[PDB]
Structures are given as structure tokens and as C-alpha cells.
Short mmCIF file of C-alpha atoms in Angstrom, two decimals:
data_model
loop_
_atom_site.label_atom_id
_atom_site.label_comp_id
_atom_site.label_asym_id
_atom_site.label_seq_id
_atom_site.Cartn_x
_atom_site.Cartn_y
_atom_site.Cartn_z
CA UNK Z 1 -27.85 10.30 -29.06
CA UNK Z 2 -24.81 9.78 -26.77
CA UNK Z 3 -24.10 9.22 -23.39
CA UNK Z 4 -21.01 10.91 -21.35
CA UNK Z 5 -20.68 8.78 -18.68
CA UNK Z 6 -17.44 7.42 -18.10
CA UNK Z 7 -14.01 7.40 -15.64
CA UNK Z 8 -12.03 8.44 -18.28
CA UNK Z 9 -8.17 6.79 -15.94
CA UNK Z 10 -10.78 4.16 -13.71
CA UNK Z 11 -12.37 5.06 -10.54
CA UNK Z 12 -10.51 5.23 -7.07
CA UNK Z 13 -14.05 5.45 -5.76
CA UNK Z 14 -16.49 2.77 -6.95
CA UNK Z 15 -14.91 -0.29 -8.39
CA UNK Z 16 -12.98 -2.10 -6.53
CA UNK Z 17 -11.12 -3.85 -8.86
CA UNK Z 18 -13.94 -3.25 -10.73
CA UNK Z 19 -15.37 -6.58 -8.52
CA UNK Z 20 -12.93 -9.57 -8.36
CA UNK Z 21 -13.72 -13.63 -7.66
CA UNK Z 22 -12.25 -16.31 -8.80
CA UNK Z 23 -9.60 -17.86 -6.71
CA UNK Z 24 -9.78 -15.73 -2.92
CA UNK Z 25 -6.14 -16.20 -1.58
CA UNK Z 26 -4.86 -18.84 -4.61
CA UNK Z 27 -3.88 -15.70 -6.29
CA UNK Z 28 -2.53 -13.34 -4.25
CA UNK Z 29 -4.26 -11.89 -0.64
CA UNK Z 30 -5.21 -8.64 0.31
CA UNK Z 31 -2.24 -8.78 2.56
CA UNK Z 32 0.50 -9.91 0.33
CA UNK Z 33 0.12 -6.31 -1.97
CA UNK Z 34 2.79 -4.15 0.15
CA UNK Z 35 2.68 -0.88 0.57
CA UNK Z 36 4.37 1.28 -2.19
CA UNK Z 37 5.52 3.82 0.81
CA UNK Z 38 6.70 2.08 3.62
CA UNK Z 39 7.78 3.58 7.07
CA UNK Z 40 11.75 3.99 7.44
CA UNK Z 41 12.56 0.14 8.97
CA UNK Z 42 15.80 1.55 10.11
CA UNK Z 43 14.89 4.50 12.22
CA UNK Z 44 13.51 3.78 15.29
CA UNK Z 45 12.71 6.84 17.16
CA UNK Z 46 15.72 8.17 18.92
CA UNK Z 47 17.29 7.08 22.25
CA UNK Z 48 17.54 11.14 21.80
CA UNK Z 49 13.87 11.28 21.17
CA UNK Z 50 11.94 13.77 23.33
CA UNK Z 51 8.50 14.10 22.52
CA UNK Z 52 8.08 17.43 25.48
CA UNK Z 53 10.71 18.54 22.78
CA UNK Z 54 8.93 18.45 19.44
CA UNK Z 55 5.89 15.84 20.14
CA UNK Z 56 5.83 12.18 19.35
CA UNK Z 57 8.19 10.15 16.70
CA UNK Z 58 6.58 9.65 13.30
CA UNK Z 59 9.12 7.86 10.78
CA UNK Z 60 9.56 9.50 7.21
CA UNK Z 61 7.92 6.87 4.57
CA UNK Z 62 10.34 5.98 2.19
CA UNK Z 63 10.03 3.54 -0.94
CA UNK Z 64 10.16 -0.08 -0.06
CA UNK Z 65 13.39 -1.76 -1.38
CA UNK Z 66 11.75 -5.37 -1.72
CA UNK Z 67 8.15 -4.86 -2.63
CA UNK Z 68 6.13 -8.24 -3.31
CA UNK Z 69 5.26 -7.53 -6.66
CA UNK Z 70 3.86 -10.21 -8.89
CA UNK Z 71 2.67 -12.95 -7.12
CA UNK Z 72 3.52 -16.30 -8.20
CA UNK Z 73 2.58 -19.87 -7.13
CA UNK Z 74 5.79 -20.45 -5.00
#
């Protein structure tokens, strides 16, 4: 017999972190892990921005330049 039963890449559905404890914030927070895509932090909407033009101002996401990364203990 055999079984099948298996992710194959880990699953975005039902493992979060496939369940994490340890140290709660002396390792990182759920806060610190930045977004990959970040909205544009130099646009902001146009003094030329008329939204009975085209609708309201969204930002393009763009990558973040400074990303956290690895946390450390500093």
C-alpha cells in the first residue's frame, strides 16, 4: 500500500507556518515581515487628481527598496 497525500511546494492554505511557538515577538513579529509589494511612498495622489475624472487615487505597488529581511537581535 501507499498513500498520496501530500502538498507537493507546502500549503498556502492550512499550515501556517506549519504551527510556530517558541519565542512570540523575541524572534521576529508578525509586523516586522514587510510587505514584498509596497505602495509607491513617493506618489501621493495628484494636486491634479480628479476623482469625477477617472475615480479615486490608488498608488501602483512597487518593490520595497529596504525590506526588513532577516531579523536579528539588534
Amino acid at each position: 500500500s501507499k498513500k498520496i497525500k501530500d502538498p507537493d511546494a507546502a500549503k498556502p492554505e492550512d499550515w501556517d507556518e506549519r504551527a510556530k511557538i517558541d519565542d512570540p515577538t523575541d524572534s521576529k513579529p508578525e509586523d516586522w515581515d514587510k510587505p514584498e509589494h509596497i505602495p509607491d511612498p513617493d506618489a501621493k495622489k495628484p494636486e491634479d487628481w480628479d476623482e469625477e475624472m477617472d475615480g479615486e487615487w490608488e498608488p501602483p505597488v512597487i518593490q520595497n527598496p529596504e525590506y526588513k529581511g532577516e531579523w536579528k537581535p539588534r
